[PDB]
Structure formats: C-alpha cells, structure tokens
Design a protein around this ligand. Sequence first.
Ligand SMILES: Cc1cc2nc3c(=O)[nH]c(=O)nc-3n(C[C@H](O)[C@H](O)[C@H](O)COP(=O)(O)O)c2cc1C
Ligand SMILES: Cc1cc2nc3c(=O)[nH]c(=O)nc-3n(C[C@H](O)[C@H](O)[C@H](O)COP(=O)(O)O)c2cc1C
Lengths: 180, 180
Amino acid sequence: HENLYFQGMEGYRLLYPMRTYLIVSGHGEETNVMAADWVTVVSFDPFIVGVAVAPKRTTHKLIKKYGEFVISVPSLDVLRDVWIAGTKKGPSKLKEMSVTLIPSKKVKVPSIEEALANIECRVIDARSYGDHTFFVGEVVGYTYKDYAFEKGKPNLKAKFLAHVSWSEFVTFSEKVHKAE
Amino acid sequence: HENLYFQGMEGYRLLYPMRTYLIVSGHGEETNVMAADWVTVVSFDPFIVGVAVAPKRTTHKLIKKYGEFVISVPSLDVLRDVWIAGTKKGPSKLKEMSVTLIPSKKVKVPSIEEALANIECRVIDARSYGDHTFFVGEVVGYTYKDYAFEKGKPNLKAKFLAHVSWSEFVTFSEKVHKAE
Ligand SMILES: Cc1cc2nc3c(=O)[nH]c(=O)nc-3n(C[C@H](O)[C@H](O)[C@H](O)COP(=O)(O)O)c2cc1C
Ligand SMILES: Cc1cc2nc3c(=O)[nH]c(=O)nc-3n(C[C@H](O)[C@H](O)[C@H](O)COP(=O)(O)O)c2cc1C
C-alpha cells in the first residue's frame, strides 16, 4: 500500500485473502469501474451492502454525483480486466477492458455482462471512517449467471475471485467441508 | 436464512463465498464468541474494521456493553468450533469449544490462541442498517501466527476459512494467479 510510513505488513492484511469485486459507477460516457475488496453485506432484510471507497477514487466522485452503484462479481477469467479496473483511473480505462456494459434493471449505472452477478445499489448512507468513505447501498435489483449460482448457492466451478496480496489472486478449492 | 418469506436465493448469497471470522466479546465469565461473515476493512490509516451484527445476538449486547471486540481468524482446522460459535447462543457455548482464551494486548476482550490472527477493536461507531447493527472498530492491537502470514502476506497453507452456503465451507486453492 502507498502511504505506509512504517514498513511491514499492513494490519489490514490480517483479514486477507478477501474477495475482490468490481464497482461500477456513473452512466453514459461517465461510466467507470474500479476493483474493490472492501465490500460486505450489512443487512439481510432489506438487502443492504456497503463498500469502502477512498475519496481519491474517481468512483468516489461518481457515487457522490449519482447516488448509485453496481457491485459486479468477477471470475478469475476476467482477472486482466480486474487488474485494469484496480490500477487505471477513470472512464478512459474501459477502452482497455474486455468487459461489455449492459443496462441495469433499476439503477442508471450499468451492469457488466461478463460478471457472475451484478448487484444494483441506491446509496442510503455515506460515512467517513479514517481514509475511506463507507458507502452504504440499498439493493434495488440484481442479475446473475444461473450456472454460477445453480441450486441457490455459489457454484465453485465459476472461479470466484479473491485477493491475496498486491498482485496475487486465488480462487477457492472445490472440495466442500460440511459442518453438520 | 430464517425470516425468508419468499423462498429462493437470499440476494446476499450473490456476494458468497465470503470469509468467515470469529467475533469475541465480553470478558471474564461474560466472554462470548460468535461466527461472522459480514466483516470488512473500512480504513487503512488508521486501521478500522466493521462487522454487521444482528441485535438478537448475545454478541450485540456484549459489544454494546463493553465497547470492544476481537476479530479472530479461524482456519478450516477449527471448523467444529466455528460451527458451535455460529449456532449456539451465549457464553455457555465455550465449554463446548476446543479453543483457548488468552489475554489481548490492548482491549479487555480476550483473544483466541488457536486463531491465525486476533484483531483487537475499540468501537467508534454503531449504525443500524436494516436488520443488523454495523459496529465500526478502530484497531488498537493485533497478534497473529507468523507461519500464517510469513513474508508479509497470507500463507494459503494455513487453510483460511470461507463460507459457501449454510453448512458448507471451503478454503482457497494454493495456486496463485499473478496479475502483473
Ligand atoms: C484487487 C484490488 C482491490 C481494491 N480494493 C479497493 C477498495 O476496496 N476500496 C478502494 O477505495 N480502492 C480499492 N482498490 C483501488 C482502486 O481499485 C484503484 O485505486 C482504481 O484505480 C480506482 O480507479 P478510479 O479512480 O477510476 O475509481 C483496489 C485495487 C485492487 C487492484
Ligand atoms: C458461518 C456463519 C457466519 C455468520 N455470520 C454472521 C454475521 O456476519 N453477523 C451476525 O449477526 N450473525 C452471523 N451468524 C450468526 C451467529 O454467529 C449466530 O447467531 C450465533 O449463535 C450468535 O451467538 P451469540 O448469540 O452468542 O452472539 C453467522 C453464523 C455462521 C454459522
């Protein structure tokens, strides 16, 4: 991470590996995508999600402007596009990305066709905790690839993406361990 | 999930598989542990984390009472204890759990010796989003197993735990994919 004055392991790496998602924001010619690890569910009913976004991201400006975002779930197969989303800045990066933008069902921000799922969100809160804003979004729509979630649970063959450390990513083992 | 009136896939399953952690709360005879998937990092500097906890959890009462919690990172090896933490209620469950409580460095809430890491947190915010409270904690200490994070990144041999769907868990593949 940049801004690490005391060299060593960022305390945050203790929570890793973390799932990696894509955050889509803006619409029209302003459409943007960035990578995000710091995403979680914050409510079951209603379904509400949250994402920590640094004010320096173009995505931050676009979420503030439009009050909407989409969480798109990438597979290992689109890692090159995830890397571009997580390294290049602003809407001009899309012309380097293999992904196709498609209309969302409820929000104006588009979805990514290649994504395993697209979760459409309306911002209901934004709080500043340290050096990121935690954008909290009510889920107002979603789409997904049926094979990625067949029988109502994630299908581990779909190669869900996780981030280990800076440029290193993994997927999950297919061997399921049963707790009961 | 219980409280699902319209049968089908909970929208939240679109974010799965998610990492599973343990949340320790209380101290002394009031010490408790529950499982939690809905945990993320919300700030790099200072290091701040957040966890979504339903008001019905004993953990919720204990975090509210003491203003502190610990995020303990479990491996696949302690899955039986994770399952007990995520199914039984309150401090009496610990006598069914294989884990050992040890003192934390900065908070009063104890750490788990068997955990890959223990992240000690002081509550700085608590917001109610739908049916959970998002407890936001400033990190004031941490400990970890050196082999689990050798060379400053997670060691995938340590068998970090992820949750697929209700009773099903996985770990990560050891094959690392490089983005650059
Ligand atoms: C795997 C990965 C995960 C990332 N996670 C986050 C995150 O959770 N929050 C954040 O603000 N930035 C995160 N970043 C950084 C942004 O994706 C990166 O700064 C991006 O260039 C922002 O582009 P934008 O300026 O077009 O919004 C991540 C980067 C990568 C590669
Ligand atoms: C794998 C797993 C993950 C869970 N994640 C959460 C969570 O993120 N937030 C939450 O409030 N409950 C979560 N639960 C439910 C609690 O762990 C469960 O209700 C537990 O019995 C609470 O115990 P307590 O009443 O002693 O706090 C999870 C359960 C499991 C099995």
